[PDB]
Design a binder for this molecule. Structure first.
Ligand SMILES: OC[C@H]1O[C@H](O[C@H]2[C@H](O)[C@@H](O)[C@@H](O[C@H]3[C@H](O)[C@@H](O)[C@@H](O[C@H]4[C@H](O)[C@@H](O)[C@@H](O[C@H]5[C@H](O)[C@@H](O)[C@@H](O[C@H]6[C@H](O)[C@@H](O)[C@@H](O[C@H]7[C@H](O)[C@@H](O)[C@H](O)O[C@@H]7CO)O[C@@H]6CO)O[C@@H]5CO)O[C@@H]4CO)O[C@@H]3CO)O[C@@H]2CO)[C@H](O)[C@@H](O)[C@@H]1O
Ligand SMILES: [Ca+2]
Ligand SMILES: [Ca+2]
Length: 508
């Protein structure tokens, strides 16, 4: 539908919706697996030191879990096709509005181009290249890779800035200048990876612009991931770009539902939902980001039995956990960090910190960072699907990005790192910053937010022996894998359909 049938406003809104909702066609793929969020999240989380997918029988899960996928990877095709599809939609909107000079359309085009740029970043970060097309048409996309792609995204962002909303002036959910600046800061931070030439001075500069804007850090970390993060100034003042989610109106199995339902199982107190999928749990390496010595991690003694009765309600579960100091609040206290939103209690069965074999959901601690509970205690909209928004872009990213840029430039990054540690009410403060502390802090601050893999690759820790974590590369204590795994392969299906695309080095 074009011309007189083109619903500009409607298509504009759908532009943003692709970030958090699945439409309504790949073979053997549940609709709930096609989302922009879920596919990119898995590609940047499942293979990392942050988490594990409990149901390994699911297609392509073992491959992603241990960094052993191939060009026939179903989950690689999923994110590749999803990213490409969203872009064709943006190109369509831009083509249909081309030539329109009214203030309204200009702003919409700026934001759409912002959204397209973000998508091209994922292509660049995940594949080092992307099936490029500036317009909507029949023509096969051409290949745009590395430096040229990097330069295109940067140029897009630089060109559309002037037309975007001032920081915190756009309707909640839409991207403003600070979102623009944050994306560029991320690009610059990883410029070394994408172009072979680092540019930390620029990453620092754009990070400072974001930090110097109206955005501010939420005083209660957990609130950023709660049901009312779209009706709480404390959380909203930090969320530069949210992915709206609603228990009744905006549902997505791969949306906040994925982060809440996917990390819970029946028996856990305060599930915030009626459905616990028991899918995502933390690896020992994740827990170690909060407990350098895993022996300090509050755990139930192995010689203590868990009653088969009397543990049916949250009240009973909590009381039992308190007796053994294993309530999440007890986990946070022992961790001396508000971000230690983990659970080792008996709700759902005995938990392990590390496992000799990936058997089930309880082989690692549970992650209760995402919640379908409002900080003000008010009712949520639905008993199953969460109202919780996904704060894709948070101000915290600017502090860690500037901190990393300063450190790599030979300066003192303690100031920026302690800004986040202070917010999380950390008992331990950083006296000096090391590469190790930085990558560890990136995990403590952003675990389960869909970016882990990218930070690891930048630190040369994703495939190498520089950092081995439980189950990395398929080995209990971790093992390395080929360096070509730092980039996902181009789906064989697209290699076959578009001769313009060349496979990434290393893959067959
Ligand atoms: O008919 C269309 C429908 O088909 C499928 O759903 C039906 C099943 O095919 C059918 O067999 C029956 O499922 C029951 C099983 O038969 C029964 O054995 C038991 O299943 C076990 C399962 O065997 C275990 O592996 C374990 O399951 C895990 C999964 O392995 C995890 O991946 C996770 O799951 C979640 C998905 O990952 C999410 O994407 C989402 O799934 C939704 C799809 O994304 C969406 O497109 C679709 O429309 O709805 C899906 C949900 O209904 O949520 C999933 C969790 O709900 O977590 C589960 C749970 O740990 O444990 C289960 C439970 O013991 O029980 C099964 C359910 O009763 O009935 C199914 C319909 O309810 C497709 O899966 C579905 O997408 C199609 O629409
Ligand atoms: Ca409300
Ligand atoms: Ca919401």
């Amino acid at each position: 539908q074009t011309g007189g049938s083109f619903d500009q406003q409607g298509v504009f809104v759908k532009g943003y919706a692709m970030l958090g909702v699945t439409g309504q066609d790949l073979d053997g793929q549940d609709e709930g697996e096609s989302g922009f969020y879920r596919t990119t999240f898995n590609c940047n989380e499942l293979p990392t030191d942050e988490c594990l997918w409990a149901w390994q029988k699911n297609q392509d899960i073992p491959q992603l879990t241990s960094i052993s996928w191939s060009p026939s990877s179903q989950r690689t095709e999923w994110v590749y096709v999803r990213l490409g599809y969203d872009i064709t939609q943006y190109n369509f909107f831009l083509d249909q509005t081309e030539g329109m000079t009214d203030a309204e359309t200009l702003r919409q085009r700026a934001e759409i181009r912002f959204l397209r740029a973000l998508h091209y970043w994922y292509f660049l970060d995940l594949f080092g290249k992307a099936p490029f097309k500036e317009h909507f048409s029949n023509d096969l996309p051409v290949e745009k890779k590395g430096t040229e792609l990097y330069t295109y995204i940067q140029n897009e962002l630089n060109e559309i800035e002037a037309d975007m909303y001032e920081p915190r002036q756009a309707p909640f959910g839409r991207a403003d200048k600070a979102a623009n600046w944050l994306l560029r800061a991320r690009l610059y931070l990883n410029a070394g990876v994408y172009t072979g030439q680092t540019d930390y001075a620029k990453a620092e500069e754009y990070a400072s612009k974001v930090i110097g804007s109206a955005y501010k850090l939420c005083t209660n970390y957990s609130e950023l991931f709660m049901a009312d993060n779209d009706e709480n100034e404390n959380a909203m003042q930090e969320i530069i770009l949210p992915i709206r989610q609603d228990g009744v109106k905006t549902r997505n199995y791969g949306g906040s539902t994925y982060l809440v339902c996917g990390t819970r199982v029946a028996g856990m107190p305060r599930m915030g939902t009626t459905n616990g999928w028991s899918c995502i749990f933390a690896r020992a390496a994740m827990v170690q980001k909060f407990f350098s010595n895993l022996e300090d991690v509050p755990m139930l003694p192995a010689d203590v039995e868990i009653p088969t009765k009397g543990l049916d309600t949250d009240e009973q579960i909590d009381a039992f956990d308190a007796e053994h100091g294993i309530r999440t609040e007890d986990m946070i206290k022992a961790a001396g960090d508000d971000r230690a939103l983990l659970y080792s209690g008996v709700g759902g069965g005995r938990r392990k910190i590390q496992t000799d074999a990936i058997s089930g959901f309880t082989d690692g601690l549970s992650i209760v960072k995402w919640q379908n509970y409002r900080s003000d205690g008010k009712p949520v909209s639905h008993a199953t699907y969460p109202d919780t928004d996904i704060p894709l872009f948070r101000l915290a990213e600017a502090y860690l990005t500037r901190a990393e840029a300063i450190f790599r430039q030979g300066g003192d990054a303690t100031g920026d790192i302690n800004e986040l540690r202070k917010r999380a009410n950390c008992t331990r403060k950083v006296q000096t910053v090391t590469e190790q502390e930085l990558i560890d802090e990136w995990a403590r601050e952003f675990y389960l937010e869909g970016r882990r893999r990218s930070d690891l690759v930048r630190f040369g820790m994703f495939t190498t022996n520089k950092y081995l974590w439980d189950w990395k590369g398929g080995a209990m204590n971790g093992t390395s894998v080929a360096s070509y795994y730092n980039k996902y392969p181009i789906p064989v299906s697209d290699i076959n359909n578009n001769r313009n695309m060349s496979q990434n080095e290393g893959y067959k």
